[PDB]
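Dear colleagues,

For the upcoming journal club I promised to circulate an example of a predicted protein-ligand complex. I picked one with sodium ion because it came up in last month's discussion. The inputs are reproduced below in full, followed by the predicted structure.
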Amino acid sequence: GEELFTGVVPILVELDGDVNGHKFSVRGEGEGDATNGKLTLKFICTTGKLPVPWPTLVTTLVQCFSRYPDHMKRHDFFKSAMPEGYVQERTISFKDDGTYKTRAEVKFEGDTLVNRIELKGIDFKEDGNILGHKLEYNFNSHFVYITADKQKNGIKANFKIRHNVEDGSVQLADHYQQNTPIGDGPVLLPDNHYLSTQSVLSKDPNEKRDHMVLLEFVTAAGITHGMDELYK
Ligand code: NA
Protein backbone atom coordinates (compact mmCIF):
# COMPACT_ATOMS: atom_id res chain seq x y z
CA GLY A 1 0.00 0.00 0.00
CA GLU A 2 0.79 3.66 0.37
CA GLU A 3 3.32 3.32 3.20
CA LEU A 4 5.80 1.53 0.93
CA PHE A 5 6.00 4.58 -1.34
CA THR A 6 6.19 7.55 1.05
CA GLY A 7 9.88 8.13 0.42
CA VAL A 8 12.43 7.56 -2.34
CA VAL A 9 12.38 3.97 -3.52
CA PRO A 10 15.17 2.24 -5.47
CA ILE A 11 14.11 0.69 -8.79
CA LEU A 12 15.51 -2.13 -10.91
CA VAL A 13 14.20 -2.91 -14.40
CA GLU A 14 15.10 -6.04 -16.41
CA LEU A 15 13.84 -6.62 -19.95
CA ASP A 16 14.47 -9.56 -22.27
CA GLY A 17 13.19 -8.93 -25.78
CA ASP A 18 12.82 -10.50 -29.21
CA VAL A 19 11.68 -8.27 -32.10
CA ASN A 20 11.51 -10.00 -35.49
CA GLY A 21 14.12 -12.46 -34.20
CA HIS A 22 16.52 -9.78 -32.92
CA LYS A 23 17.30 -10.73 -29.31
CA PHE A 24 18.23 -8.00 -26.84
CA SER A 25 18.36 -7.22 -23.13
CA VAL A 26 17.88 -3.96 -21.23
CA ARG A 27 18.73 -3.18 -17.61
CA GLY A 28 17.61 -0.08 -15.74
CA GLU A 29 18.40 1.42 -12.36
CA GLY A 30 17.12 4.49 -10.60
CA GLU A 31 14.61 5.67 -8.07
CA GLY A 32 11.00 6.69 -7.69
CA ASP A 33 9.34 9.42 -5.60
CA ALA A 34 5.64 8.61 -5.74
CA THR A 35 4.74 11.50 -3.44
CA ASN A 36 5.81 13.82 -6.27
CA GLY A 37 5.04 11.40 -9.10
CA LYS A 38 8.66 11.39 -10.23
CA LEU A 39 10.90 8.69 -11.74
CA THR A 40 14.59 9.03 -12.58
CA LEU A 41 16.03 6.02 -14.41
CA LYS A 42 18.94 5.08 -16.63
CA PHE A 43 18.67 2.14 -19.02
CA ILE A 44 21.45 0.27 -20.83
CA CYS A 45 21.15 -2.23 -23.67
CA THR A 46 23.39 -4.86 -22.16
CA THR A 47 23.53 -7.05 -25.26
CA GLY A 48 24.99 -4.28 -27.41
CA LYS A 49 23.09 -2.03 -29.80
CA LEU A 50 19.32 -1.83 -29.40
CA PRO A 51 17.48 -3.07 -32.51
CA VAL A 52 14.48 -0.76 -32.01
CA PRO A 53 14.28 2.92 -31.07
CA TRP A 54 14.52 3.58 -27.34
CA PRO A 55 11.24 5.56 -27.30
CA THR A 56 9.30 2.46 -28.37
CA LEU A 57 10.30 0.80 -25.06
CA VAL A 58 9.44 3.62 -22.62
CA THR A 59 5.95 2.42 -21.73
CA THR A 60 7.15 -1.17 -21.21
CA LEU A 61 10.15 -0.19 -19.06
CA VAL A 62 6.05 1.08 -12.92
CA GLN A 63 2.74 2.88 -12.54
CA CYS A 64 2.86 2.33 -8.78
CA PHE A 65 4.95 5.56 -8.75
CA SER A 66 2.01 7.66 -9.96
CA ARG A 67 1.05 10.60 -7.72
CA TYR A 68 -2.56 10.05 -6.65
CA PRO A 69 -4.25 13.10 -5.09
CA ASP A 70 -5.37 12.55 -1.50
CA HIS A 71 -9.05 12.34 -2.52
CA MET A 72 -8.21 9.63 -5.08
CA LYS A 73 -5.95 7.39 -2.98
CA ARG A 74 -8.59 4.67 -2.67
CA HIS A 75 -8.46 4.26 -6.46
CA ASP A 76 -4.73 3.36 -6.56
CA PHE A 77 -4.77 -0.30 -7.54
CA PHE A 78 -1.04 -0.36 -8.22
CA LYS A 79 0.11 0.44 -4.69
CA SER A 80 -2.71 -1.64 -3.18
CA ALA A 81 -1.19 -4.77 -4.72
CA MET A 82 2.19 -4.21 -3.12
CA PRO A 83 4.52 -5.65 -2.00
CA GLU A 84 3.45 -9.00 -3.47
CA GLY A 85 2.91 -7.16 -6.76
CA TYR A 86 1.07 -7.46 -10.05
CA VAL A 87 1.40 -8.87 -13.54
CA GLN A 88 1.22 -6.23 -16.29
CA GLU A 89 0.47 -7.41 -19.83
CA ARG A 90 0.17 -5.31 -22.95
CA THR A 91 -0.43 -5.53 -26.65
CA ILE A 92 1.11 -2.52 -28.43
CA SER A 93 0.02 -2.10 -32.06
CA PHE A 94 2.20 0.18 -34.16
CA LYS A 95 -0.02 1.62 -36.89
CA ASP A 96 0.93 0.23 -40.32
CA ASP A 97 3.69 -1.87 -38.69
CA GLY A 98 4.33 -4.64 -36.17
CA THR A 99 3.11 -5.47 -32.68
CA TYR A 100 4.74 -5.84 -29.26
CA LYS A 101 3.34 -8.27 -26.69
CA THR A 102 4.71 -7.77 -23.18
CA ARG A 103 4.38 -9.55 -19.84
CA ALA A 104 5.96 -8.14 -16.72
CA GLU A 105 5.90 -8.75 -12.98
CA VAL A 106 6.21 -5.68 -10.75
CA LYS A 107 6.97 -6.41 -7.08
CA PHE A 108 9.25 -5.52 -4.19
CA GLU A 109 12.50 -7.34 -3.44
CA GLY A 110 12.85 -5.88 0.02
CA ASP A 111 13.37 -2.14 -0.39
CA THR A 112 13.73 -2.29 -4.19
CA LEU A 113 10.84 -2.13 -6.65
CA VAL A 114 11.56 -4.51 -9.54
CA ASN A 115 9.95 -4.59 -13.00
CA ARG A 116 10.90 -7.81 -14.83
CA ILE A 117 9.69 -7.96 -18.43
CA GLU A 118 9.54 -10.30 -21.40
CA LEU A 119 8.77 -8.64 -24.74
CA LYS A 120 7.96 -10.28 -28.10
CA GLY A 121 7.67 -8.22 -31.29
CA ILE A 122 6.51 -9.56 -34.64
CA ASP A 123 5.51 -8.43 -38.13
CA PHE A 124 7.71 -5.32 -38.18
CA LYS A 125 8.76 -3.83 -41.50
CA GLU A 126 12.48 -3.96 -42.13
CA ASP A 127 12.52 -0.30 -43.18
CA GLY A 128 9.48 0.81 -41.24
CA ASN A 129 9.85 3.53 -38.62
CA ILE A 130 10.82 1.02 -35.91
CA LEU A 131 13.36 -1.35 -37.45
CA GLY A 132 14.48 1.55 -39.69
CA HIS A 133 15.14 3.83 -36.70
CA LYS A 134 13.14 6.77 -38.02
CA LEU A 135 11.73 7.91 -34.66
CA GLU A 136 12.97 11.06 -32.94
CA TYR A 137 14.66 10.66 -29.56
CA ASN A 138 11.97 12.37 -27.52
CA PHE A 139 8.62 11.67 -25.92
CA ASN A 140 5.21 13.27 -25.77
CA SER A 141 2.74 13.63 -22.93
CA HIS A 142 -0.23 11.24 -22.79
CA PHE A 143 -3.37 10.16 -20.89
CA VAL A 144 -3.72 6.54 -19.69
CA TYR A 145 -7.36 5.50 -19.23
CA ILE A 146 -7.96 3.02 -16.41
CA THR A 147 -11.01 0.90 -15.63
CA ALA A 148 -11.61 -1.94 -13.19
CA ASP A 149 -11.75 -5.54 -14.44
CA LYS A 150 -13.85 -7.37 -11.84
CA GLN A 151 -13.57 -10.78 -13.52
CA LYS A 152 -9.75 -10.69 -13.43
CA ASN A 153 -9.70 -8.89 -10.05
CA GLY A 154 -7.56 -6.10 -11.53
CA ILE A 155 -7.59 -3.27 -14.03
CA LYS A 156 -7.46 -2.63 -17.75
CA ALA A 157 -6.06 0.44 -19.46
CA ASN A 158 -5.98 1.85 -22.96
CA PHE A 159 -4.10 4.75 -24.50
CA LYS A 160 -2.46 5.89 -27.73
CA ILE A 161 1.23 6.79 -27.71
CA ARG A 162 2.36 9.33 -30.31
CA HIS A 163 5.95 8.87 -31.50
CA ASN A 164 7.42 11.76 -33.49
CA VAL A 165 8.95 10.59 -36.77
CA GLU A 166 12.01 12.34 -38.20
CA ASP A 167 10.09 13.51 -41.32
CA GLY A 168 7.54 15.39 -39.20
CA SER A 169 4.84 12.71 -39.22
CA VAL A 170 3.57 10.83 -36.16
CA GLN A 171 3.70 7.08 -35.53
CA LEU A 172 0.81 5.86 -33.38
CA ALA A 173 1.26 2.99 -30.93
CA ASP A 174 -2.06 1.72 -29.59
CA HIS A 175 -1.75 0.27 -26.09
CA TYR A 176 -4.09 -2.30 -24.55
CA GLN A 177 -3.13 -3.20 -20.97
CA GLN A 178 -4.28 -5.64 -18.28
CA ASN A 179 -2.99 -5.82 -14.70
CA THR A 180 -3.67 -8.78 -12.41
CA PRO A 181 -2.53 -8.99 -8.77
CA ILE A 182 -0.05 -11.67 -7.73
CA GLY A 183 -1.54 -13.91 -5.05
CA ASP A 184 -4.91 -13.61 -3.35
CA GLY A 185 -4.57 -10.55 -1.11
CA PRO A 186 -7.26 -7.88 -1.16
CA VAL A 187 -6.89 -5.04 -3.66
CA LEU A 188 -8.53 -1.68 -4.43
CA LEU A 189 -10.57 -1.88 -7.66
CA PRO A 190 -10.91 1.73 -8.84
CA ASP A 191 -13.55 3.82 -10.48
CA ASN A 192 -12.70 4.94 -14.00
CA HIS A 193 -9.92 7.52 -14.03
CA TYR A 194 -6.76 8.40 -15.91
CA LEU A 195 -3.05 8.95 -15.50
CA SER A 196 -1.41 12.06 -16.94
CA THR A 197 2.14 11.30 -18.09
CA GLN A 198 5.10 13.45 -19.16
CA SER A 199 8.60 12.27 -20.02
CA VAL A 200 12.05 13.66 -20.88
CA LEU A 201 14.59 11.48 -22.71
CA SER A 202 18.30 12.35 -22.55
CA LYS A 203 21.80 10.90 -22.83
CA ASP A 204 24.63 10.54 -20.34
CA PRO A 205 27.66 12.21 -21.98
CA ASN A 206 30.04 9.86 -20.15
CA GLU A 207 28.25 6.67 -21.24
CA LYS A 208 29.54 4.84 -24.30
CA ARG A 209 27.04 1.99 -24.17
CA ASP A 210 23.69 2.27 -25.96
CA HIS A 211 21.45 3.78 -23.32
CA MET A 212 18.53 6.03 -22.33
CA VAL A 213 18.29 8.48 -19.42
CA LEU A 214 14.65 9.03 -18.45
CA LEU A 215 12.81 11.53 -16.28
CA GLU A 216 9.10 10.79 -15.94
CA PHE A 217 6.24 12.51 -14.12
CA VAL A 218 2.85 10.86 -13.67
CA THR A 219 -0.25 11.96 -11.77
CA ALA A 220 -3.76 10.57 -11.47
CA ALA A 221 -6.90 12.55 -12.25
CA GLY A 222 -10.47 12.23 -13.42
CA ILE A 223 -12.30 12.03 -10.08
CA THR A 224 -13.17 15.11 -8.02
CA HIS A 225 -15.30 13.94 -5.06
CA GLY A 226 -13.46 14.93 -1.90
CA MET A 227 -11.19 17.56 -3.47
CA ASP A 228 -12.57 20.29 -1.27
CA GLU A 229 -10.35 23.11 -2.56
CA LEU A 230 -12.33 22.83 -5.83
CA TYR A 231 -15.61 23.91 -4.19
CA LYS A 232 -14.63 27.58 -3.90
NA1 NA B 1 -2.02 6.20 -3.52
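Two points we might discuss: Residues 1-232 form a domain with the Green Fluorescent Protein fold (CATH 2.40.155.10). The chain has one domain: 1-232.

See you all on Thursday,
B. R.
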